[PDB]
Amino acid sequence: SKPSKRSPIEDLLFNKVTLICAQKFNGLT
Amino acid sequence: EKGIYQTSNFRVQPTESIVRFPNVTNLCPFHEVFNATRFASVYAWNRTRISNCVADYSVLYNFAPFFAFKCYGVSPTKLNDLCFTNVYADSFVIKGNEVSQIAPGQTGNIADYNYKLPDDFTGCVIAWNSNKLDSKHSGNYDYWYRSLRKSKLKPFERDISTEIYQAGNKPCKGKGPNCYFPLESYGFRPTYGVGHQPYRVVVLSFELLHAPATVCGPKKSTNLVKNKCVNFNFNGLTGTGVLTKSNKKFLPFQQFGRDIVDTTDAVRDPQTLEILDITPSFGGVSVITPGTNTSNQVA
Amino acid sequence: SKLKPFERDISTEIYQAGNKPCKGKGPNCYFPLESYGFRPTYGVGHQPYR
Amino acid sequence: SNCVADYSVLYNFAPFFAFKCYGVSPTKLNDLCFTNVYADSFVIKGNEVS
Amino acid sequence: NTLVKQLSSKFGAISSVLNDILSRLDPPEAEVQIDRLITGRLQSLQTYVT
Amino acid sequence: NTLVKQLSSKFGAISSVLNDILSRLDPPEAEVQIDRLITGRLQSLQTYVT
Amino acid sequence: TTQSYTNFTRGVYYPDKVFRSSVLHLTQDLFLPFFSNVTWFAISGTNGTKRFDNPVLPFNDGVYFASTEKSNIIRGWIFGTTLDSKTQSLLIVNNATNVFIKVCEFQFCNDPMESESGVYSSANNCTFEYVSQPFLMKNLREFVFKNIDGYFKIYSKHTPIIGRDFPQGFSALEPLVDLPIGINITRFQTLLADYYVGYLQPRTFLLKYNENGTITDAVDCALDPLSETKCTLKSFTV
Ligand SMILES: *[C@@H]1O[C@H](CO)[C@@H](O[C@@H]2O[C@H](CO)[C@@H](O)[C@H](O)[C@H]2NC(C)=O)[C@H](O)[C@H]1NC(C)=O
Ligand SMILES: *[C@@H]1O[C@H](CO)[C@@H](O)[C@H](O)[C@H]1NC(C)=O
Ligand SMILES: *[C@@H]1O[C@H](CO)[C@@H](O)[C@H](O)[C@H]1NC(C)=O
Ligand SMILES: *[C@@H]1O[C@H](CO)[C@@H](O)[C@H](O)[C@H]1NC(C)=O
Ligand SMILES: *[C@@H]1O[C@H](CO)[C@@H](O)[C@H](O)[C@H]1NC(C)=O
Ligand SMILES: *[C@@H]1O[C@H](CO)[C@@H](O)[C@H](O)[C@H]1NC(C)=O
């Protein structure tokens, strides 16, 4: 059903863990 | 061989250079401080403030040839480009022998007794021989020197009260064998040797704090360009980036803005006081090669 | 203007106080040279040195 | 040697054309202890004092 | 975060901003300050890579 | 043992004992010597941690 | 005379000109320590309200000052070393229209029911004059007077409170004026025809910044173990 073909557990796992390089960019990509 | 290789880094170069400074039509009177009608002494030197003006240092160059023109924390040629938050001017007249002692972190009798600069000194020292201007044969009493001081002076400390220094612990007054008279004020005749010849000397003390108060040099302001990669110079803050309209609610006090890291990420226009965000395009470059034994095409 | 290392500049021209040309008028003219022969009796700061 | 190295006597003794300490601070002599203080005395032309 | 924050350090230089060093000083002292900064930033990068 | 023994090294400084540096010299040269020592000790600590 | 010495978690001010948004900035500067013993002055404190005599309190490397009042009894301040016209002394007065800052060798003329009078018939060798809008105008009238690097800086804040002497919340002091003075300023005293005095010390503070450019909360790193842990972690929640 969902746009990403992932199991419900995979969706929970991906939600739990958290092209402009806005942050930290001083030559770091 | 076949594969993907990171070779260099691309960047988007700026196309214009922008300099923004407040509309200050005043001119700083450096040449009036140097060209004093009456000159202060090393014993008691004239500190004068210079602020809210245009710090044009070519007037010094046109104003005289100089016995000495030495800048320690700043280049002698780049004064007209910088912006100096709190330029102080200390003027006096000094013997030639002690002119070499006006330098940071040095040891010498005038450093200990009359006038000293800090170890962390940002500024300039300028000296012109005064024999052909003021020195009369009868001698000028603008000169005044602390022959002996009870304790060494701190940087930029002044001590004026004259009291006799005692050889021992008992008080002394007027008796030469035990009295060290604190001063040697003396007018000097043009015929003396160079070590005693006078020198009108001015010390410019610059404090750089990214110009909350400006007194910036004689730079010519240009129109502000936004949404383009440009070399910007806002009130002494130099950089390269893209200036866009800001949605950050600065207080009227604040000027510069900063990210979690200390990178500048916003500025205030010195003229219009509009807050502008500074966005840095740059990146790696990879060459995709099938292999030179197959084809010279590359992505 | 200030010289580069090992640069030589020989042509004598008057330096102007302002933007208008000056020639021979001391108040606005800075004569570019001070060529002067010095007598042995001068102080050490002026004595010649090869 | 075998004495009290009191350097305020120098300060009371004269004003000095030069008083320069290279490896030690000029103000901290009275606090330190010097194993083998030697004293070399002479009279010299001014030009060579530097 | 630590790698980016090491850029704000001076490592003994007069300023942590390279543009200030190049705008204020002539080459023969801006080189000294920039060499101090280069040593600091190279140490930071080596530590990060390790 | 190596980490502690690196403290006795000078790394070019006049002395390996910080107290000697602060007791002998004024700030503007004690800073140079202490910066030499700081560089040495930081290198030692980085090596030990690695 | 002097009342019970109180405990404030107040007096935090914007240390610099930098704007910051949604960051916790750890900064070392001269701050009023949290829960420090501050002296309370019992209108007019040790002196009677009517009487001429004044405290002449010491200036220990910066001062935090505050006064809740409606009559505007307290008009200004003096900052100097000897305060006897021998050397330069600094003078703030607010006459409800403009504030006058003056550096001159001032001689105290015993100036102060609601009687207005002048002061300083003798002001020799004047060196500094500056003028602006009112500094003081239920308002709490928080001020911080700091003196370093030649500069004398006045920060302040005005937040009215109705039912209590002091708000229970936090309020940072936006700067008011930053003058380049030069005086040593060993001691000071308050010009008044109900004020709190504290002393700044070098402290490390963890300052919370809002999404806008303001400070909402602060932690004094040297107060308790928990504040030290918060400063170490760069977080108000441990
Ligand atoms: C930050 O400042 C703004 C005003 O500049 C505060 O007010 C809100 O501003 C937003 C802007 O998009 C509006 O949508 C809201 O309606 C405003 N709220 C009110 C009550 O006026 C904003 O609240 C401030 N941020 C915080 C966290 O206090
Ligand atoms: C590139 O920019 C366009 C708009 O100019 C945007 O629609 C697109 O999403 C961007 N590409 C990526 C990968 O984000
Ligand atoms: C500068 O000094 C010269 C000395 O001859 C004098 O003639 C001139 O009036 C002075 N100018 C100013 C502005 O002090
Ligand atoms: C010192 O500078 C002040 C600046 O106002 C000036 O009025 C005074 O004449 C100067 N005095 C000397 C001795 O240079
Ligand atoms: C400490 O804090 C309370 C407020 O919680 C205050 O009212 C009280 O006067 C203070 N006590 C002292 C300083 O002994
Ligand atoms: C503070 O004031 C006293 C008044 O006696 C003065 O002697 C002292 O010099 C002042 N402080 C400084 C740092 O000058």
Side-chain angles (χ1 to χ4, degrees), chain C residues 14-50:
Chain C
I14 290 162
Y15 177 103
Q16 281 72 40
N19 295 323
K20 187 173 180 180
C22 186
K23 294 187 181 180
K25 302 295 186 183
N28 293 287
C29 279
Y30 301 82
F31 292 84
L33 67 161
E34 59 171 47
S35 174
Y36 191 91
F38 285 90
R39 315 173 189 179
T41 63
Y42 277 78
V44 169
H46 310 281
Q47 290 183 11
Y49 283 86
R50 51 170 74 177

mmCIF file of all heavy atoms in Angstrom, chain C residues 14-50:
data_model
loop_
_atom_site.group_PDB
_atom_site.id
_atom_site.type_symbol
_atom_site.label_atom_id
_atom_site.label_comp_id
_atom_site.label_asym_id
_atom_site.label_seq_id
_atom_site.Cartn_x
_atom_site.Cartn_y
_atom_site.Cartn_z
ATOM 1 N N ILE C 14 58.041 65.757 -10.332
ATOM 2 C CA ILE C 14 57.575 66.355 -9.089
ATOM 3 C C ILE C 14 56.307 65.647 -8.632
ATOM 4 O O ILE C 14 55.403 65.366 -9.432
ATOM 5 C CB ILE C 14 57.363 67.870 -9.275
ATOM 6 C CG1 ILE C 14 58.720 68.570 -9.427
ATOM 7 C CG2 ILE C 14 56.605 68.489 -8.085
ATOM 8 C CD1 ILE C 14 58.655 69.967 -10.029
ATOM 9 N N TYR C 15 56.236 65.359 -7.336
ATOM 10 C CA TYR C 15 55.063 64.745 -6.731
ATOM 11 C C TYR C 15 54.113 65.858 -6.305
ATOM 12 O O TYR C 15 54.533 66.835 -5.676
ATOM 13 C CB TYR C 15 55.484 63.866 -5.546
ATOM 14 C CG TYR C 15 54.366 63.202 -4.758
ATOM 15 C CD1 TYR C 15 54.080 61.855 -4.940
ATOM 16 C CD2 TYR C 15 53.614 63.905 -3.822
ATOM 17 C CE1 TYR C 15 53.073 61.234 -4.228
ATOM 18 C CE2 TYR C 15 52.608 63.293 -3.108
ATOM 19 C CZ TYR C 15 52.340 61.956 -3.314
ATOM 20 O OH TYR C 15 51.338 61.337 -2.602
ATOM 21 N N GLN C 16 52.836 65.702 -6.645
ATOM 22 C CA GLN C 16 51.839 66.746 -6.442
ATOM 23 C C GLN C 16 51.113 66.554 -5.116
ATOM 24 O O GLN C 16 50.752 65.433 -4.748
ATOM 25 C CB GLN C 16 50.828 66.750 -7.590
ATOM 26 C CG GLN C 16 51.327 67.428 -8.860
ATOM 27 C CD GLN C 16 52.388 66.620 -9.584
ATOM 28 O OE1 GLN C 16 52.299 65.395 -9.673
ATOM 29 N NE2 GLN C 16 53.402 67.304 -10.103
ATOM 30 N N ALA C 17 50.907 67.662 -4.401
ATOM 31 C CA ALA C 17 50.144 67.609 -3.156
ATOM 32 C C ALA C 17 48.706 67.178 -3.418
ATOM 33 O O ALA C 17 48.160 66.329 -2.704
ATOM 34 C CB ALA C 17 50.171 68.975 -2.469
ATOM 35 N N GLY C 18 48.081 67.757 -4.443
ATOM 36 C CA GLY C 18 46.723 67.422 -4.835
ATOM 37 C C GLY C 18 46.682 66.744 -6.187
ATOM 38 O O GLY C 18 47.590 65.982 -6.533
ATOM 39 N N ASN C 19 45.631 67.018 -6.962
ATOM 40 C CA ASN C 19 45.472 66.443 -8.292
ATOM 41 C C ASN C 19 45.962 67.361 -9.402
ATOM 42 O O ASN C 19 46.305 66.869 -10.482
ATOM 43 C CB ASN C 19 43.999 66.097 -8.545
ATOM 44 C CG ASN C 19 43.488 65.011 -7.619
ATOM 45 O OD1 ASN C 19 44.210 64.072 -7.287
ATOM 46 N ND2 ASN C 19 42.235 65.135 -7.197
ATOM 47 N N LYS C 20 46.003 68.669 -9.169
ATOM 48 C CA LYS C 20 46.453 69.589 -10.202
ATOM 49 C C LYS C 20 47.966 69.456 -10.388
ATOM 50 O O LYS C 20 48.688 69.232 -9.411
ATOM 51 C CB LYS C 20 46.096 71.028 -9.835
ATOM 52 C CG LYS C 20 46.373 72.037 -10.941
ATOM 53 C CD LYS C 20 45.854 73.419 -10.579
ATOM 54 C CE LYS C 20 46.138 74.424 -11.683
ATOM 55 N NZ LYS C 20 45.641 75.785 -11.343
ATOM 56 N N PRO C 21 48.484 69.572 -11.619
ATOM 57 C CA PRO C 21 49.942 69.555 -11.791
ATOM 58 C C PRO C 21 50.617 70.710 -11.066
ATOM 59 O O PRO C 21 50.070 71.811 -10.959
ATOM 60 C CB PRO C 21 50.122 69.673 -13.308
ATOM 61 C CG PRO C 21 48.890 69.110 -13.876
ATOM 62 C CD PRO C 21 47.797 69.498 -12.925
ATOM 63 N N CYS C 22 51.822 70.440 -10.564
ATOM 64 C CA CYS C 22 52.655 71.427 -9.890
ATOM 65 C C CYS C 22 54.036 71.392 -10.524
ATOM 66 O O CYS C 22 54.548 70.319 -10.851
ATOM 67 C CB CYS C 22 52.760 71.149 -8.379
ATOM 68 S SG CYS C 22 53.645 72.422 -7.413
ATOM 69 N N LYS C 23 54.635 72.569 -10.694
ATOM 70 C CA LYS C 23 56.004 72.665 -11.198
ATOM 71 C C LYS C 23 56.655 73.899 -10.588
ATOM 72 O O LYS C 23 56.331 75.026 -10.975
ATOM 73 C CB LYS C 23 56.032 72.737 -12.724
ATOM 74 C CG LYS C 23 55.557 71.477 -13.432
ATOM 75 C CD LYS C 23 55.774 71.570 -14.934
ATOM 76 C CE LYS C 23 55.272 70.325 -15.649
ATOM 77 N NZ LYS C 23 55.484 70.403 -17.121
ATOM 78 N N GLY C 24 57.568 73.685 -9.642
ATOM 79 C CA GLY C 24 58.394 74.751 -9.119
ATOM 80 C C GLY C 24 57.796 75.569 -7.994
ATOM 81 O O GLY C 24 58.487 76.453 -7.469
ATOM 82 N N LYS C 25 56.548 75.309 -7.601
ATOM 83 C CA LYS C 25 55.882 76.062 -6.537
ATOM 84 C C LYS C 25 55.903 75.215 -5.268
ATOM 85 O O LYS C 25 55.109 74.283 -5.116
ATOM 86 C CB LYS C 25 54.459 76.432 -6.945
ATOM 87 C CG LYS C 25 54.367 77.259 -8.225
ATOM 88 C CD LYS C 25 55.012 78.631 -8.065
ATOM 89 C CE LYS C 25 54.785 79.504 -9.287
ATOM 90 N NZ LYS C 25 55.478 80.817 -9.166
ATOM 91 N N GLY C 26 56.802 75.584 -4.346
ATOM 92 C CA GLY C 26 57.053 74.789 -3.161
ATOM 93 C C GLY C 26 55.854 74.373 -2.337
ATOM 94 O O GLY C 26 55.807 73.227 -1.870
ATOM 95 N N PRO C 27 54.880 75.263 -2.097
ATOM 96 C CA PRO C 27 53.726 74.869 -1.266
ATOM 97 C C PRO C 27 52.968 73.650 -1.765
ATOM 98 O O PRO C 27 52.442 72.893 -0.940
ATOM 99 C CB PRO C 27 52.844 76.125 -1.289
ATOM 100 C CG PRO C 27 53.803 77.238 -1.437
ATOM 101 C CD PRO C 27 54.904 76.721 -2.322
ATOM 102 N N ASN C 28 52.894 73.435 -3.080
ATOM 103 C CA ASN C 28 52.228 72.272 -3.657
ATOM 104 C C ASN C 28 53.181 71.293 -4.331
ATOM 105 O O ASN C 28 52.732 70.226 -4.765
ATOM 106 C CB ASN C 28 51.171 72.728 -4.670
ATOM 107 C CG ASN C 28 50.020 73.471 -4.019
ATOM 108 O OD1 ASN C 28 49.177 72.871 -3.352
ATOM 109 N ND2 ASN C 28 49.981 74.785 -4.208
ATOM 110 N N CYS C 29 54.471 71.613 -4.428
ATOM 111 C CA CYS C 29 55.450 70.782 -5.120
ATOM 112 C C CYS C 29 56.337 70.090 -4.095
ATOM 113 O O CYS C 29 56.846 70.736 -3.172
ATOM 114 C CB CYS C 29 56.324 71.616 -6.062
ATOM 115 S SG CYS C 29 55.625 72.047 -7.690
ATOM 116 N N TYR C 30 56.517 68.779 -4.257
ATOM 117 C CA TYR C 30 57.480 67.994 -3.484
ATOM 118 C C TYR C 30 58.603 67.590 -4.433
ATOM 119 O O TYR C 30 58.428 66.699 -5.270
ATOM 120 C CB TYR C 30 56.835 66.765 -2.848
ATOM 121 C CG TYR C 30 55.689 67.058 -1.906
ATOM 122 C CD1 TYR C 30 54.410 67.289 -2.389
ATOM 123 C CD2 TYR C 30 55.890 67.106 -0.532
ATOM 124 C CE1 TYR C 30 53.362 67.555 -1.532
ATOM 125 C CE2 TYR C 30 54.848 67.371 0.332
ATOM 126 C CZ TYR C 30 53.585 67.595 -0.172
ATOM 127 O OH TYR C 30 52.543 67.863 0.684
ATOM 128 N N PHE C 31 59.749 68.246 -4.307
ATOM 129 C CA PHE C 31 60.828 68.030 -5.261
ATOM 130 C C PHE C 31 61.423 66.641 -5.035
ATOM 131 O O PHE C 31 61.749 66.295 -3.894
ATOM 132 C CB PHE C 31 61.902 69.103 -5.106
ATOM 133 C CG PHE C 31 61.450 70.474 -5.524
ATOM 134 C CD1 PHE C 31 60.759 71.289 -4.643
ATOM 135 C CD2 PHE C 31 61.701 70.940 -6.804
ATOM 136 C CE1 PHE C 31 60.336 72.547 -5.028
ATOM 137 C CE2 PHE C 31 61.280 72.197 -7.194
ATOM 138 C CZ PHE C 31 60.599 73.002 -6.305
ATOM 139 N N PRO C 32 61.582 65.818 -6.079
ATOM 140 C CA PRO C 32 61.736 64.373 -5.845
ATOM 141 C C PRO C 32 63.073 63.971 -5.246
ATOM 142 O O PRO C 32 63.200 62.816 -4.816
ATOM 143 C CB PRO C 32 61.564 63.775 -7.245
ATOM 144 C CG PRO C 32 62.057 64.836 -8.155
ATOM 145 C CD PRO C 32 61.687 66.147 -7.514
ATOM 146 N N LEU C 33 64.059 64.866 -5.188
ATOM 147 C CA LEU C 33 65.417 64.511 -4.802
ATOM 148 C C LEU C 33 65.950 65.500 -3.777
ATOM 149 O O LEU C 33 65.464 66.628 -3.650
ATOM 150 C CB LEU C 33 66.361 64.456 -6.019
ATOM 151 C CG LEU C 33 66.719 65.727 -6.804
ATOM 152 C CD1 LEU C 33 67.981 65.491 -7.621
ATOM 153 C CD2 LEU C 33 65.591 66.178 -7.726
ATOM 154 N N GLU C 34 66.964 65.049 -3.040
ATOM 155 C CA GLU C 34 67.675 65.855 -2.052
ATOM 156 C C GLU C 34 69.176 65.622 -2.171
ATOM 157 O O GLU C 34 69.875 65.454 -1.166
ATOM 158 C CB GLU C 34 67.179 65.562 -0.636
ATOM 159 C CG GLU C 34 67.315 64.113 -0.183
ATOM 160 C CD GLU C 34 67.002 63.940 1.291
ATOM 161 O OE1 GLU C 34 65.971 64.475 1.748
ATOM 162 O OE2 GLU C 34 67.788 63.268 1.990
ATOM 163 N N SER C 35 69.683 65.594 -3.404
ATOM 164 C CA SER C 35 71.108 65.377 -3.629
ATOM 165 C C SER C 35 71.927 66.459 -2.938
ATOM 166 O O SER C 35 71.680 67.656 -3.117
ATOM 167 C CB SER C 35 71.408 65.365 -5.128
ATOM 168 O OG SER C 35 72.802 65.292 -5.369
ATOM 169 N N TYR C 36 72.904 66.029 -2.143
ATOM 170 C CA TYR C 36 73.614 66.928 -1.243
ATOM 171 C C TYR C 36 74.958 66.313 -0.891
ATOM 172 O O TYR C 36 75.023 65.140 -0.510
ATOM 173 C CB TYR C 36 72.789 67.180 0.025
ATOM 174 C CG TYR C 36 73.312 68.292 0.903
ATOM 175 C CD1 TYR C 36 72.866 69.597 0.746
ATOM 176 C CD2 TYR C 36 74.238 68.033 1.906
ATOM 177 C CE1 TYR C 36 73.335 70.614 1.556
ATOM 178 C CE2 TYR C 36 74.713 69.044 2.718
ATOM 179 C CZ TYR C 36 74.258 70.332 2.539
ATOM 180 O OH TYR C 36 74.731 71.341 3.344
ATOM 181 N N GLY C 37 76.021 67.105 -1.017
ATOM 182 C CA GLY C 37 77.336 66.697 -0.562
ATOM 183 C C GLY C 37 77.548 67.087 0.886
ATOM 184 O O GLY C 37 77.287 68.229 1.275
ATOM 185 N N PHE C 38 78.037 66.137 1.677
ATOM 186 C CA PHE C 38 78.079 66.253 3.128
ATOM 187 C C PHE C 38 79.521 66.387 3.589
ATOM 188 O O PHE C 38 80.412 65.686 3.098
ATOM 189 C CB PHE C 38 77.413 65.045 3.790
ATOM 190 C CG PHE C 38 75.915 65.076 3.720
ATOM 191 C CD1 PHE C 38 75.247 64.494 2.655
ATOM 192 C CD2 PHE C 38 75.175 65.703 4.708
ATOM 193 C CE1 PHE C 38 73.868 64.528 2.583
ATOM 194 C CE2 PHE C 38 73.796 65.739 4.641
ATOM 195 C CZ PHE C 38 73.141 65.152 3.577
ATOM 196 N N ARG C 39 79.739 67.292 4.536
ATOM 197 C CA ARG C 39 81.068 67.615 5.038
ATOM 198 C C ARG C 39 81.458 66.654 6.162
ATOM 199 O O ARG C 39 80.592 66.239 6.937
ATOM 200 C CB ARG C 39 81.110 69.053 5.561
ATOM 201 C CG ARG C 39 80.441 70.092 4.652
ATOM 202 C CD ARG C 39 80.357 71.461 5.303
ATOM 203 N NE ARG C 39 79.532 72.368 4.512
ATOM 204 C CZ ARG C 39 79.264 73.628 4.830
ATOM 205 N NH1 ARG C 39 79.919 74.259 5.792
ATOM 206 N NH2 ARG C 39 78.356 74.294 4.121
ATOM 207 N N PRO C 40 82.751 66.216 6.261
ATOM 208 C CA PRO C 40 83.141 65.244 7.305
ATOM 209 C C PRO C 40 82.683 65.547 8.733
ATOM 210 O O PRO C 40 82.631 64.639 9.567
ATOM 211 C CB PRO C 40 84.674 65.250 7.227
ATOM 212 C CG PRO C 40 84.982 65.670 5.848
ATOM 213 C CD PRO C 40 83.919 66.652 5.473
ATOM 214 N N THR C 41 82.351 66.806 9.028
ATOM 215 C CA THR C 41 82.010 67.223 10.382
ATOM 216 C C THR C 41 80.584 66.862 10.787
ATOM 217 O O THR C 41 80.237 67.033 11.962
ATOM 218 C CB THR C 41 82.203 68.737 10.534
ATOM 219 O OG1 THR C 41 81.313 69.428 9.649
ATOM 220 C CG2 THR C 41 83.646 69.141 10.231
ATOM 221 N N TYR C 42 79.755 66.377 9.866
ATOM 222 C CA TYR C 42 78.388 66.020 10.211
ATOM 223 C C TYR C 42 78.367 64.840 11.182
ATOM 224 O O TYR C 42 79.334 64.085 11.312
ATOM 225 C CB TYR C 42 77.587 65.670 8.956
ATOM 226 C CG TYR C 42 77.010 66.862 8.222
ATOM 227 C CD1 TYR C 42 77.801 67.658 7.407
ATOM 228 C CD2 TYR C 42 75.660 67.175 8.328
ATOM 229 C CE1 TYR C 42 77.273 68.740 6.731
ATOM 230 C CE2 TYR C 42 75.122 68.256 7.656
ATOM 231 C CZ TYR C 42 75.933 69.034 6.858
ATOM 232 O OH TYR C 42 75.402 70.110 6.185
ATOM 233 N N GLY C 43 77.238 64.692 11.871
ATOM 234 C CA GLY C 43 77.058 63.573 12.771
ATOM 235 C C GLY C 43 76.998 62.250 12.031
ATOM 236 O O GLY C 43 76.847 62.186 10.811
ATOM 237 N N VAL C 44 77.081 61.170 12.815
ATOM 238 C CA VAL C 44 77.246 59.828 12.257
ATOM 239 C C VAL C 44 76.051 59.453 11.390
ATOM 240 O O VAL C 44 76.198 58.734 10.395
ATOM 241 C CB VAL C 44 77.481 58.814 13.401
ATOM 242 C CG1 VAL C 44 77.402 57.350 12.921
ATOM 243 C CG2 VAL C 44 78.822 59.078 14.073
ATOM 244 N N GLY C 45 74.855 59.917 11.756
ATOM 245 C CA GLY C 45 73.667 59.580 10.990
ATOM 246 C C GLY C 45 73.710 60.064 9.552
ATOM 247 O O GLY C 45 73.044 59.491 8.684
ATOM 248 N N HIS C 46 74.488 61.115 9.279
ATOM 249 C CA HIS C 46 74.655 61.654 7.934
ATOM 250 C C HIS C 46 75.977 61.272 7.279
ATOM 251 O O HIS C 46 76.158 61.557 6.090
ATOM 252 C CB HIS C 46 74.537 63.183 7.964
ATOM 253 C CG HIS C 46 73.326 63.682 8.687
ATOM 254 N ND1 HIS C 46 72.070 63.686 8.119
ATOM 255 C CD2 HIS C 46 73.178 64.191 9.932
ATOM 256 C CE1 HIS C 46 71.201 64.178 8.985
ATOM 257 N NE2 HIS C 46 71.848 64.490 10.093
ATOM 258 N N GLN C 47 76.903 60.652 8.009
ATOM 259 C CA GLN C 47 78.195 60.321 7.425
ATOM 260 C C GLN C 47 78.013 59.286 6.313
ATOM 261 O O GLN C 47 77.154 58.406 6.424
ATOM 262 C CB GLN C 47 79.147 59.772 8.488
ATOM 263 C CG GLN C 47 79.622 60.801 9.491
ATOM 264 C CD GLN C 47 80.619 60.235 10.482
ATOM 265 O OE1 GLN C 47 81.123 59.124 10.311
ATOM 266 N NE2 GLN C 47 80.912 61.000 11.529
ATOM 267 N N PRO C 48 78.794 59.357 5.233
ATOM 268 C CA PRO C 48 78.615 58.387 4.152
ATOM 269 C C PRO C 48 79.132 57.010 4.540
ATOM 270 O O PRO C 48 79.907 56.837 5.482
ATOM 271 C CB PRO C 48 79.428 58.979 2.998
ATOM 272 C CG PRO C 48 80.474 59.772 3.656
ATOM 273 C CD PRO C 48 79.863 60.320 4.913
ATOM 274 N N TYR C 49 78.674 56.021 3.780
ATOM 275 C CA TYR C 49 79.096 54.637 3.946
ATOM 276 C C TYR C 49 79.081 53.997 2.571
ATOM 277 O O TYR C 49 78.029 53.977 1.922
ATOM 278 C CB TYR C 49 78.160 53.875 4.890
ATOM 279 C CG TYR C 49 78.361 54.155 6.360
ATOM 280 C CD1 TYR C 49 77.740 55.234 6.973
ATOM 281 C CD2 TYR C 49 79.125 53.308 7.148
ATOM 282 C CE1 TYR C 49 77.905 55.483 8.320
ATOM 283 C CE2 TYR C 49 79.296 53.547 8.495
ATOM 284 C CZ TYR C 49 78.684 54.634 9.077
ATOM 285 O OH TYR C 49 78.856 54.876 10.420
ATOM 286 N N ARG C 50 80.231 53.499 2.123
ATOM 287 C CA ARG C 50 80.269 52.702 0.904
ATOM 288 C C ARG C 50 79.738 51.318 1.247
ATOM 289 O O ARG C 50 80.235 50.666 2.176
ATOM 290 C CB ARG C 50 81.671 52.618 0.299
ATOM 291 C CG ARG C 50 82.797 52.211 1.238
ATOM 292 C CD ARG C 50 84.073 51.921 0.452
ATOM 293 N NE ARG C 50 84.713 53.133 -0.048
ATOM 294 C CZ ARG C 50 85.867 53.163 -0.705
ATOM 295 N NH1 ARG C 50 86.546 52.059 -0.975
ATOM 296 N NH2 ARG C 50 86.351 54.336 -1.106
#
